[PDB]
Structure 1
Amino acid sequence: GLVPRGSMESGFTSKDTYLSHFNPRDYLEKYYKFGSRHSAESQILKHLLKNLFKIFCLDGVKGDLLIDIGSGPTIYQLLSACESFKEIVVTDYSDQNLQELEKWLKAAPAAFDWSPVVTYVCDLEGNRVKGPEKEEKLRQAVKQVLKCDVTQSQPLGAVPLPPADCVLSTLCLDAACPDLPTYCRALRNLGSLLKPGGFLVIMDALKSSYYMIGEQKFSSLPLGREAVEAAVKEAGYTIEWFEVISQSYSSTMANNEGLFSLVARKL
């Protein structure tokens, strides 16, 4: 492990490194076990959930179709969203990630245990419903599980979908875009899936060059707030609000300088 995986020739992890070398269950155990010891991962997850709750429940971001871009094997980013969107389409470049996701959607006994995150989210929303009822709401809402490639003009290929009310992407674009032009390219590609006036919700690391799953290192585009804001505006969106938090992952997992969350509207 001298360099990030799949980065020898280009200097940045290639797309295909995720098909074969990204271990979804290892990723879930390292990042989303959500213990009670206030670890950096747990505090960050807590903050991600509160913003998602605030975005989809308090700010009333709602619609028919939400497309989740770069889901990986996680569902935490959909728990509040399924209260406000009739249909959820989850996408990722890695089929192994989608299969790990699909284990939970099918409620396989071997699926990852999300219940501490489910419990946290139910509490946020005022315990109007219990854990199982919440999980069934999400499972019902997820209609399709598709392959996506943000570097493509048609990120979902030929798959037919109506214009979406919201595109959501958490912790994805930094890892998927090897340079700033590709980053702007991807945001423009993502907008092709969105109605005019539709919502773009991005949450990602700030000034991060890599992240770790065990001894596996993966590349990350280190972007500061100003670059993100410029790229989003240039790609044809108007920013509704932009938040930056200084809380960082432990260096054994990422060298990030906090995270950002933003809500934009397609022009």
Structure 2
Amino acid sequence: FTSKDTYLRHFNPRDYLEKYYKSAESQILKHLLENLFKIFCLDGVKGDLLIDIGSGPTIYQLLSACESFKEIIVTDYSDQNLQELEKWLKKEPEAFDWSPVVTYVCDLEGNRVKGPEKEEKLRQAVKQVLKCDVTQSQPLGAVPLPLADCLLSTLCLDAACPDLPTYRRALRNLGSLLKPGGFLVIMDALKSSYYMIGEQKFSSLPLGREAVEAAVKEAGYTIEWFEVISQSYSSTMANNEGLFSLVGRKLS
């Protein structure tokens, strides 16, 4: 199973963005964006602080979220990935072009702003960029942070967790960052055992709906929403059966 080490040496953040975020990849990103819209815009989910866990080099998962949460902390294990994110934050020439994705979100949200203004609201929202390891009982390190109103994690936990016990423990580690009554939002692959960035292979925990749901409940959360798309990534990308999106509340 892919080690943390392999992420630092061999996960190329720009290639990942080229592979997935420029087909099945399109159809899945469309669906994830519509779920995020639903969760952050239509549903309750609101607050002062959202912490995004395993952000990678991506910002798509934060586009509707910056409308509901004053402040966003982005986090990942790989500093190389956070640096790729930071290129976008700082509006650098070589930064990835999220404009097609941003426009789609603006569309979903009733065209009340244009892309530029939406991007400026996300850049304004992101307050800290920090290191994170979900396998650590203190995932963000030795210094305390304020407790979050929401924890967001997209396509991270299956890749971070080599087995079911570690998966449960990661949910409890992350819970320590969340205030009681805080929301846990997870989107991840279903029954996937690997994914690809070009020729480089990464492991995935092949988890099913029942296993995900039982694990989230055991870790001390209620499930408010669980939704499945049974769309696999392209044949050279992953062997997932589909993707899930769950919303949970930490117990009070």
TM-score by length of structure 1 reads: 0.93
Query: In structure 2, what is the Cα distance between the partners aligned to 1:242 and 1:112?
Result: 31
Give the Cα–Cα distance (whole angstroms) in 2 for the partners of residues 84 and 162 of structure 1. Answer: 18
What does residue 14 of structure 1 align with?
Answer: 3
CA contact (8 A) 1:60 1:84 kept: no
Q: CA deviation at 1:159?
A: 3.2
The separation in 2 between residues aligned to 1:142 and 1:96, in whole angstroms, is: 18
Alignment pair present for 1:128 and 2:109: no
Aligned mates of 2:143, 2:170 — CA distance in 1: 18
Secondary structure of 1:17's counterpart equals helix
1:250 Cα offset (Å): 1.1
Contact kept? 1:209, 1:256, Cα under 8 Å: yes
In 2, distance between residues paired with 1:130 and 1:166? Answer: 26
Structure 1: give runs of 5+ residues left out of the alignment.
1-11, 34-38
How far has the Cα of 1:20 moved from its partner?
1.2
- Structure 1: distance between partners of 2:31 and 2:10: 29
Q: Which runs of 4+ in 1 moved over 3 A?
A: none
Note the alpha carbon deviations across 1:4-47, whole angstroms, 9 max, x for none: xxxxxxxx0001111111000000000000xxxxx000000000
User: Do the aligned residues in 2 keep the contact of 1:204 with 1:259 (CA within 8 Å)?
Assistant: yes
1:241 deviation in Å? 1.3
- How many residue pairs get matched? 251
Report the CA distance between 1:160 and its aligned residue. 2.7
Deviation at 1:60, TM superposition (A): 2.6
Counterpart position of 1:170? 154
Output the CA distance in 2 between the equivalents of 1:31 and 1:57: 24
Cα contact 1:69–1:168 (8 A) shared by 2: yes
User: Which whole-Å CA distance do the structure 2 matches of 1:122 and 1:100 have between them?
Assistant: 23
Structure 2 gap segments, 5+ residues each: none
Deviations 1:77-111 (A, max 9, x none): 00000000000000000000000000000000110
Cα drift, residue 248 of structure 1: 1.1
2: distance between equivalents of 1:244 and 1:127?
27
Instruction: Give, in angstroms, the shift of residue 245 of structure 1.
Output: 1.3
Identical aligned pairs, as a percentage?
96
Q: Distance in 1 between matches of 2:81 and 2:4?
A: 13
Partner of residue 137, structure 2: 153
Q: Give the structure-2-normalised TM-score.
A: 0.99
**1:87–1:142 Cα contact (<8 Å) kept:** yes
